[PDB]
């Protein structure tokens, strides 16, 4: 009979599409040697043929999707002023105040893209024709309790449109086209606030402005937008049981264990 | 006569290929209105035609270059254990100890890619055929004195090959092909340590292993590698006078000022 620790070891080596049962009568050492062999071949194949990282390649696919649809690709600072968090309405009554990675006296790792997107919307409105369509992909940081759905270091897609055409229908059409393009099943459940759900997993929270917070950021126009976690998308796409398989990590490469 | 502050304002609005002299007899207000008009059209053009961010697009070009040459694309944690810094030999006698952005009791923002690359080399050597070729592009953080060549938040390309073919000649051929592909003039000046210089600007430091540090990381094979700052590459390519034009930023979009 396999010990719980032995079973832990084998599941780190197991692939979702693997069709091997750790409940058969085969000893640990051979089940382990079997899976080690498969995982080395998986990496050998990636090394020989494609060589692209899941998270990098997804960011590039999401980028071409939004560029082709008219959204300006933004790359803004990850290390942001702590004041941006207060100006987002994040008091201490909210959960997210406890979750901030502080850096100096006045800085933090950004837990969200909304402050920088807001700032880009305000500035670009003096130069670009209506509507203004932007998006960003990059790291975000939140302190979290251990979760199969939460990382402390993750990657956020955020997009936002300001001005004409900022309706909920249009926002749902963007979400729908986007996840149908990626091959990710979802349901949309719900100014407006809506969530994009995969079963009980939140893929995205989206929103329809104007909202009173906009005033603090110099925004006085309608808008629509959404944020998606890239690792959650990978988790669903590749059927990973734990989101750590999809993270920036030294433990996993494209969901294959690197401890062989 | 233009004040120094007025001239500061105009140079923020000026483009390297702009052919306007702030030393002519035209008043501030019209020189400013002239340049505002140009910069809005530059952004309008980007918005209408291509919409890709300089830093994102360069990362994608560098990625295809190294993937096509057989290097495995790595994305490893940006937030790393503080112990990785000591194990890199970064004592307090080195400059770099003072430059670390500490995060909790035990973490920091990575100032370099070498620890994670080292860890990937060790683990992948149990699975991949010789030679092992990896690379990574992503954020790095260092506290710096105000410089026209230094950002506190920048982007590093790092690549490393381990095993056979790890000669200085091969390392220079990779560097040479890479910068000729990008259209960036350079000179290489110099186990071995070499620098890739553009005038007095350091594009890259490279190295040839084995070196005694390798032992601490579980590496006992020869290697070659180099690190390049992406913003420095953009600075040279686009002839920016100050590296802030190329940074993750809310002040500049593809080197065009966003304060119009
Ligand atoms: N810790 C995290 N790890 C991975 N993805 C995350 C994390 N926090 C947020 N996301 C993703 O970012 C999206 C937008 O952020 P947000 O709406 O603020 O998340 P949230 O409300 O905190 N979701 P949740 O914590 O699961 O209830 C989420 O829907 C997730 O896709
Ligand atoms: N603060 C920074 N801002 C931008 N690029 C940087 C920064 N620090 C390092 N780089 C880039 O990363 C490369 C590899 O890092 P490293 O060799 O450690 O730099 P370095 O020796 O500190 N160079 P320098 O500080 O200019 O004398 C450098 O050659 C630069 O291209
Ligand atoms: N609140 C998260 C997700 C996000 C991003 C952009 C627009 C919208 Br609406 C929601 C964040 O600020 O990144
Ligand atoms: N020292 C910097 C640059 C670098 C990266 C990889 C290999 C080599 Br050699 C140099 C860093 O560690 O990122
Ligand atoms: Mg949360
Ligand atoms: Mg939410
Ligand atoms: Mg330095
Ligand atoms: Mg150097």
Coordinates of C-alpha atoms and ligand atoms in Angstrom, one line a residue:
Chain A
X1 CA 0.0 0.0 0.0
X2 CA 1.3 3.5 -1.0
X3 CA 1.9 6.0 1.8
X4 CA 0.3 9.4 1.7
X5 CA 3.8 10.9 1.1
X6 CA 4.5 8.5 -1.7
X7 CA 1.2 9.4 -3.3
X8 CA 2.1 13.1 -2.9
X9 CA 5.3 12.4 -4.8
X10 CA 3.5 10.5 -7.6
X11 CA 0.9 13.2 -8.1
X12 CA 3.5 15.9 -8.6
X13 CA 4.8 13.6 -11.4
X14 CA 1.3 12.9 -12.8
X15 CA -0.1 14.7 -15.9
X16 CA -3.9 15.4 -16.1
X17 CA -4.1 13.3 -19.3
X18 CA -2.0 10.5 -17.8
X19 CA -4.0 7.3 -17.5
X20 CA -2.2 5.6 -14.7
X21 CA -3.9 4.7 -11.3
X22 CA -1.9 5.1 -8.1
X23 CA -4.4 2.6 -6.6
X24 CA -3.2 -0.4 -8.5
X25 CA -0.9 -3.0 -7.0
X26 CA 2.4 -1.7 -8.6
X27 CA 5.1 -0.6 -6.1
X28 CA 6.0 3.0 -5.5
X29 CA 9.5 2.7 -7.1
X30 CA 8.2 1.4 -10.4
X31 CA 5.2 3.8 -10.6
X32 CA 7.7 6.6 -9.9
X33 CA 10.2 5.3 -12.4
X34 CA 7.4 5.1 -15.0
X35 CA 6.2 8.7 -14.4
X36 CA 9.8 10.0 -14.3
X37 CA 10.3 8.5 -17.7
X38 CA 7.2 10.1 -19.2
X39 CA 8.0 13.6 -17.7
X40 CA 11.5 13.6 -19.1
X41 CA 10.1 12.8 -22.6
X42 CA 7.5 15.5 -22.3
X43 CA 10.3 18.1 -21.6
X44 CA 12.5 16.5 -24.3
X45 CA 9.7 17.0 -26.7
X46 CA 9.1 20.7 -25.7
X47 CA 12.9 21.3 -26.0
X48 CA 13.1 19.7 -29.4
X49 CA 10.0 21.2 -31.0
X50 CA 8.5 24.4 -29.6
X51 CA 10.3 25.7 -26.6
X52 CA 7.8 28.4 -25.6
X53 CA 6.7 29.0 -22.1
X54 CA 3.0 28.6 -21.3
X55 CA 2.7 31.9 -19.6
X56 CA 4.8 33.8 -22.2
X57 CA 2.9 32.3 -25.1
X58 CA -0.5 33.0 -23.5
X59 CA 0.5 36.6 -23.0
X60 CA 1.5 36.8 -26.7
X61 CA -1.8 35.3 -27.8
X62 CA -3.8 37.6 -25.6
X63 CA -1.8 40.5 -26.9
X64 CA -2.5 39.8 -30.6
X65 CA -6.1 39.3 -29.8
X66 CA -6.5 42.7 -28.2
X67 CA -4.2 44.6 -30.6
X68 CA -6.1 43.2 -33.6
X69 CA -9.4 44.4 -32.0
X70 CA -8.1 48.0 -31.6
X71 CA -6.7 48.1 -28.0
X72 CA -3.4 49.9 -27.3
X73 CA -0.9 47.6 -25.6
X74 CA 0.3 49.3 -22.3
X75 CA 3.2 48.3 -20.1
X76 CA 3.1 50.4 -16.9
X77 CA 5.1 50.1 -13.6
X78 CA 4.7 47.1 -11.5
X79 CA 6.1 48.9 -8.5
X80 CA 3.5 51.7 -7.8
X81 CA 2.9 54.4 -5.2
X82 CA 1.1 53.2 -2.1
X83 CA -1.2 56.2 -2.5
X84 CA -2.7 54.6 -5.6
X85 CA -4.1 51.9 -3.3
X86 CA -5.9 54.4 -1.0
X87 CA -7.2 56.3 -4.0
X88 CA -8.8 53.1 -5.3
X89 CA -11.0 53.1 -2.3
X90 CA -9.1 50.3 -0.6
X91 CA -9.7 51.2 3.1
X92 CA -8.9 48.8 5.9
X93 CA -12.5 47.5 5.8
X94 CA -11.8 45.9 2.5
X95 CA -10.0 42.6 2.3
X96 CA -7.5 43.8 -0.2
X97 CA -5.8 46.3 2.3
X98 CA -4.3 43.3 4.2
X99 CA -3.1 41.8 1.0
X100 CA -0.6 44.5 -0.1
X101 CA 3.1 43.7 -0.4
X102 CA 4.6 47.0 0.8
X103 CA 8.1 47.9 -0.5
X104 CA 9.5 51.0 1.0
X105 CA 7.8 53.7 3.0
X106 CA 5.7 54.8 0.0
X107 CA 5.6 51.9 -2.5
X108 CA 4.0 48.5 -3.1
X109 CA 3.8 45.8 -5.6
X110 CA 0.7 46.4 -7.5
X111 CA -2.2 44.1 -6.7
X112 CA -4.3 45.3 -9.6
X113 CA -4.1 47.1 -12.9
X114 CA -6.9 49.6 -12.4
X115 CA -4.8 52.6 -11.1
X116 CA -2.4 52.5 -14.1
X117 CA -5.2 51.9 -16.6
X118 CA -7.1 54.8 -15.1
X119 CA -4.0 57.1 -15.5
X120 CA -3.5 56.0 -19.1
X121 CA -7.2 56.7 -19.9
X122 CA -7.0 60.2 -18.5
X123 CA -3.8 61.1 -20.3
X124 CA -4.6 59.4 -23.7
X125 CA -8.0 61.2 -23.8
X126 CA -6.2 64.4 -24.7
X127 CA -4.6 62.7 -27.8
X128 CA -6.7 59.8 -29.1
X129 CA -10.0 59.7 -30.9
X130 CA -13.1 58.4 -29.1
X131 CA -13.3 55.6 -28.0
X132 CA -10.1 54.9 -26.1
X133 CA -9.2 51.2 -25.9
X134 CA -6.2 50.0 -23.9
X135 CA -5.0 46.8 -22.2
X136 CA -2.1 45.5 -20.2
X137 CA -0.7 42.2 -19.2
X138 CA 1.8 41.8 -16.4
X139 CA 2.6 40.7 -12.9
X140 CA 0.4 41.5 -9.8
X141 CA 1.0 40.6 -6.2
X142 CA -1.4 39.7 -3.4
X143 CA -0.8 38.0 0.0
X144 CA -3.2 35.0 0.0
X145 CA -4.1 32.1 2.2
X146 CA -3.0 28.8 0.7
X147 CA -5.3 28.0 -2.2
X148 CA -5.5 25.8 -5.1
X149 CA -6.8 28.9 -7.0
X150 CA -4.6 31.6 -5.6
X151 CA -1.0 32.6 -6.2
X152 CA 0.8 35.4 -4.4
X153 CA 2.6 36.3 -7.7
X154 CA 0.3 36.1 -10.7
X155 CA -0.3 37.7 -14.1
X156 CA -3.3 39.9 -14.8
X157 CA -4.9 40.8 -18.1
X158 CA -6.8 44.1 -17.8
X159 CA -8.6 45.9 -20.5
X160 CA -10.6 49.1 -20.6
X161 CA -12.6 51.1 -23.1
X162 CA -13.7 54.7 -22.5
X163 CA -16.2 56.9 -24.3
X164 CA -18.7 55.7 -26.9
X165 CA -19.8 52.1 -27.2
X166 CA -19.3 51.4 -23.4
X167 CA -22.4 49.2 -22.9
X168 CA -22.7 46.0 -21.0
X169 CA -23.7 44.2 -24.2
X170 CA -20.4 45.3 -25.9
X171 CA -18.5 44.3 -22.8
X172 CA -20.0 40.8 -22.9
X173 CA -19.3 40.5 -26.6
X174 CA -15.6 41.2 -25.9
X175 CA -15.5 38.6 -23.1
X176 CA -17.4 36.0 -25.1
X177 CA -15.3 36.4 -28.2
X178 CA -12.1 36.4 -26.1
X179 CA -12.8 33.1 -24.2
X180 CA -14.2 31.4 -27.3
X181 CA -11.0 32.3 -29.1
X182 CA -9.0 30.7 -26.2
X183 CA -11.2 27.7 -25.9
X184 CA -12.3 28.3 -22.3
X185 CA -15.8 27.4 -21.1
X186 CA -17.4 30.1 -19.0
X187 CA -20.6 31.6 -17.7
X188 CA -21.3 35.3 -17.2
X189 CA -23.2 36.1 -13.9
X190 CA -24.4 39.5 -12.7
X191 CA -23.1 50.8 -12.7
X192 CA -22.9 47.1 -13.5
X193 CA -20.5 44.6 -12.0
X194 CA -20.3 41.1 -13.5
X195 CA -18.2 38.0 -13.0
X196 CA -17.0 35.5 -15.5
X197 CA -17.1 32.0 -13.9
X198 CA -15.7 28.6 -14.7
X199 CA -17.7 26.4 -12.4
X200 CA -16.9 27.9 -9.0
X201 CA -13.6 29.5 -10.2
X202 CA -13.7 33.2 -10.9
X203 CA -12.0 33.9 -14.3
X204 CA -12.7 37.6 -14.3
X205 CA -14.5 40.5 -12.7
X206 CA -15.7 43.1 -15.1
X207 CA -17.4 46.5 -14.7
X208 CA -19.4 49.2 -16.4
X209 CA -18.7 52.9 -15.6
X210 CA -19.3 55.7 -14.8
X211 CA -18.9 55.0 -11.0
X212 CA -18.2 57.6 -8.3
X213 CA -14.5 56.5 -7.9
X214 CA -13.8 57.8 -11.5
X215 CA -13.8 61.4 -10.2
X216 CA -10.6 60.8 -8.1
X217 CA -8.7 59.7 -11.2
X218 CA -9.8 62.5 -13.5
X219 CA -12.3 60.2 -15.5
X220 CA -15.7 61.7 -16.3
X221 CA -16.7 59.4 -19.2
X222 CA -18.5 56.1 -19.5
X223 CA -16.3 53.0 -19.7
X224 CA -16.2 49.2 -19.7
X225 CA -13.5 46.8 -18.7
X226 CA -12.5 43.5 -17.1
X227 CA -9.6 41.7 -15.4
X228 CA -8.5 38.1 -16.0
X229 CA -5.9 36.0 -14.3
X230 CA -3.7 34.3 -16.8
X231 CA -2.7 31.4 -14.5
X232 CA -6.4 30.7 -13.8
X233 CA -6.9 30.5 -17.6
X234 CA -4.0 28.1 -17.9
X235 CA -5.3 26.0 -15.0
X236 CA -8.7 25.6 -16.8
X237 CA -7.2 25.1 -20.3
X238 CA -4.8 22.4 -19.1
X239 CA -7.0 21.0 -16.4
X240 CA -4.4 21.5 -13.7
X241 CA -5.7 20.6 -10.2
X242 CA -3.5 23.2 -8.5
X243 CA -2.8 26.7 -9.9
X244 CA 0.9 26.3 -8.9
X245 CA 1.4 24.2 -12.1
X246 CA 0.8 27.3 -14.1
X247 CA 2.7 29.9 -12.1
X248 CA 6.0 31.5 -12.6
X249 CA 7.9 28.9 -10.8
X250 CA 11.1 26.8 -10.5
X251 CA 9.0 23.7 -9.7
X252 CA 7.0 23.4 -12.9
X253 CA 7.7 24.0 -16.6
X254 CA 4.5 24.1 -18.7
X255 CA 2.9 22.1 -15.9
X256 CA 5.6 19.4 -16.0
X257 CA 7.5 18.9 -12.7
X258 CA 11.1 20.0 -12.8
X259 CA 12.1 17.7 -9.9
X260 CA 12.9 14.6 -11.8
Chain B
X1 CA 14.6 84.1 -24.3
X2 CA 13.3 80.7 -23.1
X3 CA 13.6 80.0 -19.4
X4 CA 15.3 76.8 -18.3
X5 CA 12.0 75.4 -17.1
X6 CA 10.3 76.2 -20.4
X7 CA 13.2 74.4 -22.1
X8 CA 12.7 71.4 -19.8
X9 CA 9.0 71.3 -20.9
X10 CA 9.9 71.5 -24.6
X11 CA 12.5 68.7 -24.4
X12 CA 10.0 66.4 -22.8
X13 CA 7.8 67.1 -25.9
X14 CA 10.8 66.8 -28.4
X15 CA 11.4 63.6 -30.5
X16 CA 15.0 62.6 -31.4
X17 CA 14.3 62.9 -35.1
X18 CA 12.5 66.2 -34.5
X19 CA 14.2 69.0 -36.4
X20 CA 13.2 72.0 -34.4
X21 CA 15.6 74.3 -32.5
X22 CA 14.6 75.7 -29.1
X23 CA 17.2 78.3 -29.7
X24 CA 15.3 80.2 -32.4
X25 CA 13.3 83.3 -31.8
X26 CA 9.9 81.7 -31.6
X27 CA 8.0 82.1 -28.3
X28 CA 7.5 79.3 -25.8
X29 CA 3.8 79.1 -26.3
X30 CA 4.0 78.5 -30.1
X31 CA 7.0 76.1 -29.9
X32 CA 4.9 74.2 -27.3
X33 CA 1.8 74.2 -29.3
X34 CA 3.8 73.0 -32.3
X35 CA 5.3 70.0 -30.5
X36 CA 2.0 69.2 -28.7
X37 CA 0.5 68.9 -32.2
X38 CA 3.2 66.6 -33.4
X39 CA 3.1 64.3 -30.4
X40 CA -0.6 63.9 -30.6
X41 CA -0.3 62.8 -34.2
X42 CA 2.5 60.4 -33.3
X43 CA 0.1 58.7 -30.8
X44 CA -2.8 58.9 -33.2
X45 CA -0.7 57.0 -35.8
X46 CA 0.4 54.3 -33.3
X47 CA -3.2 53.9 -32.2
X48 CA -4.5 53.7 -35.8
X49 CA -1.8 51.4 -37.3
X50 CA 0.2 49.2 -35.0
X51 CA -0.7 49.6 -31.3
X52 CA 2.2 47.6 -29.9
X53 CA 4.3 48.7 -26.9
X54 CA 8.0 49.1 -27.5
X55 CA 9.0 47.0 -24.5
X56 CA 6.4 44.3 -25.2
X57 CA 7.3 44.1 -28.9
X58 CA 11.1 43.9 -28.1
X59 CA 10.5 41.1 -25.6
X60 CA 8.6 39.2 -28.3
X61 CA 11.3 39.8 -30.9
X62 CA 14.1 38.7 -28.5
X63 CA 11.9 35.6 -27.7
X64 CA 11.5 34.5 -31.3
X65 CA 15.2 35.0 -31.8
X66 CA 16.3 32.8 -28.9
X67 CA 13.5 30.2 -29.4
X68 CA 14.5 29.8 -33.0
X69 CA 18.1 29.3 -32.0
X70 CA 17.3 26.4 -29.6
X71 CA 16.9 28.2 -26.2
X72 CA 14.1 27.2 -23.9
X73 CA 11.9 30.1 -22.9
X74 CA 11.8 30.4 -19.0
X75 CA 9.5 32.5 -16.9
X76 CA 10.6 32.2 -13.2
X77 CA 9.5 34.1 -10.1
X78 CA 10.3 37.8 -9.9
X79 CA 9.9 37.8 -6.1
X80 CA 12.7 35.5 -4.9
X81 CA 14.2 34.3 -1.6
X82 CA 16.6 36.8 -0.1
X83 CA 19.0 33.8 0.5
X84 CA 19.5 33.6 -3.3
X85 CA 21.3 37.0 -3.1
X86 CA 23.8 35.7 -0.5
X87 CA 24.4 32.5 -2.4
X88 CA 25.3 34.6 -5.4
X89 CA 28.3 35.9 -3.5
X90 CA 26.7 39.3 -2.9
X91 CA 28.3 40.2 0.4
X92 CA 28.1 43.7 1.8
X93 CA 31.5 44.6 0.2
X94 CA 29.8 44.4 -3.2
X95 CA 27.8 47.4 -4.5
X96 CA 24.8 45.3 -5.2
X97 CA 24.0 44.5 -1.6
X98 CA 22.9 48.1 -1.0
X99 CA 20.7 47.9 -4.1
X100 CA 18.2 45.2 -3.1
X101 CA 14.6 46.0 -2.7
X102 CA 13.7 43.9 0.3
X103 CA 10.1 42.7 0.6
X104 CA 9.3 40.7 3.7
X105 CA 11.7 39.2 6.2
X106 CA 12.9 36.7 3.7
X107 CA 12.2 38.0 0.2
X108 CA 13.3 40.6 -2.3
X109 CA 12.7 41.8 -5.8
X110 CA 15.2 40.0 -8.0
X111 CA 18.0 42.3 -9.1
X112 CA 19.4 39.7 -11.6
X113 CA 18.4 36.5 -13.4
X114 CA 21.4 34.4 -12.5
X115 CA 19.9 32.5 -9.4
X116 CA 16.8 31.3 -11.3
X117 CA 18.7 30.4 -14.5
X118 CA 21.2 28.5 -12.3
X119 CA 18.3 26.6 -10.7
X120 CA 16.8 25.8 -14.1
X121 CA 20.2 24.6 -15.4
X122 CA 20.6 22.2 -12.5
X123 CA 17.1 20.7 -12.8
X124 CA 16.9 20.5 -16.6
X125 CA 20.2 18.7 -16.8
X126 CA 18.4 15.6 -15.4
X127 CA 16.0 15.7 -18.4
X128 CA 17.4 17.4 -21.4
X129 CA 20.2 16.4 -23.9
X130 CA 23.5 18.2 -23.8
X131 CA 23.8 21.1 -24.4
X132 CA 21.1 22.9 -22.2
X133 CA 20.1 26.3 -23.6
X134 CA 17.7 28.5 -21.7
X135 CA 16.8 32.2 -21.6
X136 CA 14.4 34.5 -19.7
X137 CA 13.0 38.0 -20.1
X138 CA 11.4 39.9 -17.3
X139 CA 11.5 42.6 -14.6
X140 CA 14.4 43.2 -12.3
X141 CA 14.8 45.8 -9.6
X142 CA 17.8 47.7 -8.3
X143 CA 18.1 50.9 -6.2
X144 CA 20.1 53.3 -8.2
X145 CA 21.4 56.9 -8.1
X146 CA 19.6 59.1 -10.6
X147 CA 21.0 58.2 -14.0
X148 CA 20.3 58.8 -17.6
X149 CA 21.3 55.1 -18.0
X150 CA 19.7 53.5 -14.9
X151 CA 16.1 52.6 -13.9
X152 CA 15.1 51.1 -10.6
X153 CA 12.6 48.9 -12.5
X154 CA 14.0 47.5 -15.7
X155 CA 13.8 44.4 -17.9
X156 CA 16.6 41.9 -18.3
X157 CA 17.3 39.4 -21.0
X158 CA 19.4 36.6 -19.6
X159 CA 20.5 33.5 -21.5
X160 CA 22.7 30.6 -20.6
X161 CA 24.1 27.5 -22.3
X162 CA 25.5 24.6 -20.3
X163 CA 27.6 21.6 -21.5
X164 CA 29.2 21.2 -24.9
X165 CA 30.0 24.2 -27.1
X166 CA 30.5 26.6 -24.2
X167 CA 33.4 28.5 -25.6
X168 CA 34.0 32.3 -25.7
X169 CA 34.0 32.2 -29.5
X170 CA 30.5 30.7 -29.4
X171 CA 29.4 33.2 -26.8
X172 CA 30.6 36.1 -29.0
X173 CA 28.9 34.6 -32.1
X174 CA 25.6 34.6 -30.2
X175 CA 26.0 38.2 -29.0
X176 CA 27.1 39.3 -32.5
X177 CA 24.2 37.6 -34.3
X178 CA 21.8 38.9 -31.7
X179 CA 22.7 42.6 -31.9
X180 CA 23.1 42.5 -35.7
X181 CA 19.6 41.1 -35.9
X182 CA 18.3 44.0 -33.7
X183 CA 20.4 46.7 -35.6
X184 CA 22.3 47.8 -32.5
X185 CA 26.0 48.9 -32.9
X186 CA 28.4 47.5 -30.3
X187 CA 31.9 46.5 -29.3
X188 CA 32.9 43.5 -27.2
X189 CA 35.7 44.3 -24.7
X190 CA 37.4 41.8 -22.3
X191 CA 36.9 32.1 -16.5
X192 CA 36.3 34.9 -18.9
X193 CA 34.1 38.0 -18.3
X194 CA 33.3 40.3 -21.2
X195 CA 31.3 43.4 -21.7
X196 CA 29.2 44.5 -24.6
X197 CA 29.6 48.3 -24.9
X198 CA 27.7 51.0 -27.0
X199 CA 30.2 53.8 -26.6
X200 CA 30.3 54.2 -22.8
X201 CA 27.0 52.5 -22.2
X202 CA 27.1 48.9 -21.0
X203 CA 24.6 46.8 -23.0
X204 CA 25.6 43.5 -21.5
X205 CA 27.9 41.7 -19.2
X206 CA 28.7 38.1 -20.3
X207 CA 30.6 35.2 -18.8
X208 CA 32.3 31.9 -19.4
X209 CA 32.1 29.2 -16.8
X210 CA 33.1 27.1 -14.9
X211 CA 33.6 29.4 -12.0
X212 CA 33.8 28.5 -8.3
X213 CA 30.4 30.0 -7.5
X214 CA 28.8 27.2 -9.6
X215 CA 29.4 24.7 -6.9
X216 CA 26.9 26.4 -4.6
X217 CA 24.2 26.0 -7.2
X218 CA 24.8 22.4 -8.0
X219 CA 26.5 23.2 -11.4
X220 CA 29.6 21.3 -12.3
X221 CA 29.6 21.8 -16.1
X222 CA 31.0 24.5 -18.4
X223 CA 28.7 27.3 -19.5
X224 CA 28.3 30.6 -21.3
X225 CA 25.8 33.3 -20.9
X226 CA 25.0 37.0 -20.9
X227 CA 22.6 39.6 -19.6
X228 CA 21.2 42.5 -21.5
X229 CA 19.0 45.4 -20.3
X230 CA 16.0 45.8 -22.7
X231 CA 15.5 49.5 -21.9
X232 CA 19.2 50.2 -22.7
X233 CA 18.6 48.5 -26.1
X234 CA 15.6 50.7 -26.8
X235 CA 17.5 53.8 -25.7
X236 CA 20.2 53.1 -28.2
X237 CA 17.8 51.9 -31.0
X238 CA 15.6 55.0 -30.7
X239 CA 18.4 57.4 -29.7
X240 CA 16.6 58.5 -26.5
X241 CA 18.7 60.8 -24.4
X242 CA 17.3 59.5 -21.1
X243 CA 16.5 55.9 -20.4
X244 CA 13.2 57.0 -18.8
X245 CA 11.7 57.3 -22.3
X246 CA 11.9 53.5 -22.6
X247 CA 10.8 52.4 -19.2
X248 CA 7.6 51.0 -17.9
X249 CA 6.1 54.3 -17.2
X250 CA 3.0 56.4 -17.1
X251 CA 5.0 59.4 -18.5
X252 CA 6.0 58.0 -21.9
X253 CA 4.4 55.7 -24.4
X254 CA 6.9 54.4 -27.0
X255 CA 9.1 57.4 -26.1
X256 CA 6.3 59.9 -26.7
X257 CA 5.3 62.0 -23.7
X258 CA 1.9 61.3 -22.3
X259 CA 1.6 64.8 -20.7
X260 CA 0.0 66.6 -23.6
Ligands
LIG1 N1 -4.2 35.6 -6.0 C1 -4.5 35.5 -7.2 N2 -4.0 34.5 -8.0 C2 -4.4 34.3 -9.2 N3 -5.3 35.0 -9.9 C3 -5.8 36.0 -9.2 C4 -5.5 36.3 -7.9 N4 -6.2 37.4 -7.4 C5 -6.9 37.7 -8.5 N5 -6.7 36.9 -9.6 C6 -7.3 37.0 -10.9 O1 -7.5 38.4 -11.2 C7 -8.9 38.6 -11.5 C8 -9.3 40.0 -11.2 O2 -9.0 40.3 -9.8 P1 -10.1 40.5 -8.7 O3 -11.5 40.6 -9.4 O4 -9.7 41.6 -7.8 O5 -10.0 39.1 -8.0 P2 -10.8 38.7 -6.7 O6 -12.1 39.4 -6.5 O7 -9.9 38.9 -5.5 N6 -11.1 37.0 -7.0 P3 -11.0 35.9 -5.8 O8 -9.9 36.3 -4.8 O9 -10.8 34.5 -6.4 O10 -12.5 35.9 -5.1 C9 -9.6 37.5 -10.8 O11 -10.9 37.2 -11.3 C10 -8.7 36.3 -11.0 O12 -8.8 35.8 -12.4
LIG2 N1 19.5 49.9 -13.2 C1 19.5 49.3 -14.4 N2 18.7 49.9 -15.4 C2 18.7 49.4 -16.6 N3 19.4 48.4 -17.1 C3 20.2 47.9 -16.1 C4 20.3 48.2 -14.8 N4 21.2 47.5 -14.1 C5 21.6 46.6 -15.0 N5 21.0 46.8 -16.2 C6 21.3 46.0 -17.5 O1 21.5 44.7 -17.1 C7 22.8 44.2 -17.6 C8 23.4 43.1 -16.8 O2 23.4 43.6 -15.4 P1 24.8 43.9 -14.7 O3 25.9 43.4 -15.6 O4 24.7 43.4 -13.3 O5 24.8 45.4 -14.7 P2 25.9 46.4 -14.1 O6 27.2 45.8 -13.9 O7 25.3 46.8 -12.7 N6 26.0 47.6 -15.2 P3 26.2 49.2 -14.7 O8 25.3 49.4 -13.4 O9 25.7 50.2 -15.8 O10 27.7 49.4 -14.5 C9 23.6 45.5 -17.7 O11 24.7 45.5 -18.7 C10 22.5 46.5 -18.3 O12 22.2 46.3 -19.6
LIG3 N1 -9.7 44.8 -10.4 C1 -8.6 44.2 -11.1 C2 -9.2 43.6 -12.4 C3 -9.6 44.7 -13.4 C4 -8.6 45.4 -14.3 C5 -9.0 46.4 -15.1 C6 -10.4 46.7 -15.2 C7 -11.3 46.0 -14.4 BR1 -13.2 46.4 -14.4 C8 -10.9 45.0 -13.5 C9 -7.5 45.2 -11.5 O1 -7.7 46.4 -11.2 O2 -6.5 44.8 -12.1
LIG4 N1 24.2 39.3 -13.9 C1 23.0 39.6 -14.5 C2 23.1 39.4 -16.0 C3 23.3 38.0 -16.4 C4 22.2 37.0 -16.6 C5 22.5 35.7 -16.9 C6 23.8 35.3 -17.2 C7 24.8 36.2 -17.1 BR1 26.7 35.7 -17.4 C8 24.6 37.5 -16.7 C9 21.9 38.6 -14.1 O1 22.2 37.7 -13.3 O2 20.7 38.7 -14.5
LIG5 MG1 -9.2 38.0 -3.7
LIG6 MG1 -13.4 39.7 -8.3
LIG7 MG1 25.1 48.6 -11.5
LIG8 MG1 28.1 44.5 -15.7

